[PDB]
Design a protein around this ligand. Structure first.
Ligand SMILES: CC(=O)[C@@](O)(COP(=O)(O)O)C(O)O
Ligand SMILES: CC(=O)[C@@](O)(COP(=O)(O)O)C(O)O
Ligand SMILES: [Mn+2]
Ligand SMILES: [Mn+2]
Lengths: 208, 208
């Protein structure tokens, strides 16, 4: 079962603690959601430590639809409305980029958007970076990779902005627990679940 | 120079004719835009012949932001407004898909959207497929990969719906003419330019 497969990453509390330390070290983590939800694994990176190499791995090994998980406050600061009456309108840096799709341009757009001093005019719309508004309460309100990203950053003591993308197998199928475990071992990325995070937050009265 | 590098693909007319035949054979082509525009190469496939394997190659070797090039008429049939007051709101098949990111789900969404008998209720919004409205006149009106895709399909006698994505190098940089030429040789894909198509259409009074 999933718990048996992830037991080599440790018990749920150790899986959360190892992931938080990986992010504090500027490294990525793999977050699995519920098996009855998407049963999908996402590469997660802190924006504060984001590099062109990390973005290039995400584009090469994931869907290529790299999402920028922001707080509702940061999304409001950037005047980002929902795309349709939690994908917001897509975004590009107004300055510092060319076509916007290059790993470097996506990082330039992500850093511009996550800047706590950012202004809406810093971002042109539409673009090739997809911001997602995290629900207030995080995984304790909505059990999605969007909320897991903000909560991982807040619990690691980092800026509440992270990038996520769905790990995709070479044949186009979406990675399932065994493929995610192998990818994490190969790329030294800790693997954890939203369930691990929810129980960690409830046990450590972790209001964020 | 670019013309010298593409001379091995033939003269401009042969580059267009070989690309059209590749599409009639259900194979993909690589379209370069102007070097003073994006200087980017896109993998192009007809939707009529689209396979999960072709979609998986596109996701693995391109940006992962796979766009569905539609006529303004097909976009109006699907009630697709521009994303911001030519990216439309993103789309997912309402039926036949799970999370929408899998190569198979993206093809299911693309075939549902390009169906000449499609109705807006067939597509949920937002999603992981990005439709683009082609300008009336195609490359003779706008010199973009969006217009090159519709024109390639119409000139090949195929349904006017195609998928495009920007060829991306493993390091996250965007492929330039030499990398595009090598990728085309390796994957048996003809390489051509918007300039080749514009001159072909003007010389053969090709109103579409
Ligand atoms: C990009 C994703 O990861 C989604 O998984 C969106 O994120 P959520 O898990 O719903 O928060 C995708 O399924 O659209
Ligand atoms: C996906 C692309 O290819 C764009 O190139 C959009 O297509 P256009 O070439 O502008 O028609 C990208 O640059 O947003
Ligand atoms: Mn998800
Ligand atoms: Mn283009």
């Amino acid at each position: 079962n999933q718990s048996s497969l992830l037991a080599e990453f440790g018990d749920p509390i150790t899986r959360v603690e190892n992931a938080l330390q990986a992010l504090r070290e500027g490294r990525g983590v793999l977050l699995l959601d519920d098996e009855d939800r998407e049963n999908e694994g996402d590469i997660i990176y802190a924006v504060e430590s984001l590099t062109t190499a990390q973005m290039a791995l995400m584009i090469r090994e994931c869907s290529g639809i790299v999402c920028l998980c922001l707080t509702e406050a940061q999304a409001d600061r950037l005047a980002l409305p929902p795309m349709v009456v939690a994908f917001t309108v897509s975004i590009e840096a107004k300055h510092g980029v060319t076509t916007g799709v290059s790993a470097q341009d996506r990082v330039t757009t992500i850093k511009t958007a996550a800047n706590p001093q950012a202004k809406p005019e810093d971002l042109a719309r539409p673009g090739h970076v997809f911001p997602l508004r995290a629900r207030a309460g995080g995984v304790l309100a909505r059990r999605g990779h969007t909320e897991g990203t903000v909560d991982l950053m807040q619990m690691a003591g980092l800026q509440p902005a992270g990038v996520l993308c769905e790990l995709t197998n070479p044949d186009g199928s979406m990675a399932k627990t065994p493929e995610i475990i192998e990818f994490g071992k190969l790329h030294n990325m800790p693997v954890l679940t939203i369930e691990d995070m929810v129980q960690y937050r409830i046990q450590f009265d972790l209001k964020l």
